[PDB]
């Protein structure tokens, strides 16, 4: 039941903070994906780093507007809160060793 | 140079053909068991390609354990309500980039 992801692109909105009692450090990874003249598509992925230690090092080493390579697992969060009547999913790319990790190229 | 690449392996479910805004797709579900705690995830797999989708819809049967090899996309979408903005997480599969493969034994 292998789940896997690899991403490369610009970093944005880097933040620390906790998930439900869990030190996290997420950020957006915008990816350009030229769909099959004359338009291109982008894809902002919520990269969510767990493991307070890895969470910390990531938090420090990763700068804004960077270009990093993200290995990790793709997760789906049921979310769906009040304010409306419908269930949607949260597409966050979970990164926490010994799962994946984040290298930096810019 | 951006890189959006996913890989999957798990159980398939609710397989059906149709169109994505007038596009011959064969959407279905792949369930990776991302693991006492057994955490599951049900991924949507939208296989575009007039021929490709048909290809897939026939060799691919429910229960089959297959691999998925494609982009991680997410349609914005603006439901009747409400102000809450939500994205639709699926997996765009389409040759020569996408790739599907059933497992036997």
């Amino acid at each position: 039941s292998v789940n896997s992801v690899t991403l490369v692109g610009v970093v944005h909105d880097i933040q620390s903070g906790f998930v439900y009692e869990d030190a996290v450090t997420q950020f957006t990874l915008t990816t350009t994906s030229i769909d099959t003249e004359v338009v291109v598509e982008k894809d902002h992925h919520t990269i969510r780093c767990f493991g307070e230690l890895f969470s910390a090092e990531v938090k420090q080493k990763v700068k804004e507007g960077n270009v990093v390579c993200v290995n990790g697992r793709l997760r789906l969060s049921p979310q769906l809160e009040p304010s409306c009547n419908k269930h949607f999913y949260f597409p966050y790319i979970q990164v926490q060793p010994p799962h994946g990790q984040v290298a930096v190229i810019h | 140079k951006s890189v959006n690449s996913v890989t999957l392996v798990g159980v398939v479910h609710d397989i059906q053909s149709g169109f994505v805004y007038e596009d011959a797709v064969t959407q279905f579900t792949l369930t990776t068991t991302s693991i006492v705690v057994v955490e599951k995830d049900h991924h949507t797999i939208r296989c575009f390609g007039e021929l490709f989708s048909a290809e897939v819809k026939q060799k691919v049967k429910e229960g089959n354990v297959v691999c998925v090899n494609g982009r991680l996309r997410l349609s914005p979408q603006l439901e009747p309500s409400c102000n809450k903005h939500f994205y639709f997480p699926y997996i765009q599969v389409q040759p020569p980039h996408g790739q599907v493969a059933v497992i036997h034994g």
């Epitope: 903070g17 998930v19 009692e21 919520t46 809160e81 009040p82 304010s83 | -």
Partner: nanobody
């Protein structure tokens, strides 16, 4: 706000019972909450979330079944459970869902929880 689940134990398949949750102790209202039940070896599953006013949503599996309500003056989560299937049998927790996406906030902490068996 240090969570505190309460109420629960055992009831017939079809029996009923209500749960509870308290926190010490601020700030309610501003924060929307919910209830999370967990199977023996399975992951926690959020059941129903109550809005900041608050409106409410439920799980596709529990729609038209469970009923959740909240009180601000006493900071209490109320979960009146009726006619309980052995499926509902799980460790129920109560905590604050939020952000519906842009999560990561404060420190957060999990309550001990309450038992539900039918």
């Amino acid at each position: 706000v240090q969570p505190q689940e309460s109420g629960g134990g055992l009831a017939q398949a079809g029996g009923s019972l209500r749960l509870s949750c308290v926190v010490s102790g601020i700030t309610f209202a501003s924060e929307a909450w919910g209830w999370y039940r967990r199977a023996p070896g399975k992951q926690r599953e959020l059941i129903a979330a109550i809005n900041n006013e608050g409106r409410t949503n439920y799980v596709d599996s529990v729609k038209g079944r469970f009923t959740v309500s909240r009180d601000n003056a006493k900071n209490v989560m109320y979960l009146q459970m009726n006619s309980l299937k052995p499926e509902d049998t799980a460790v129920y927790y109560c905590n604050a869902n939020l952000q519906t996406g842009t999560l990561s906030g404060a420190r957060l902490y999990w309550g001990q929880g309450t038992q539900v068996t039918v």
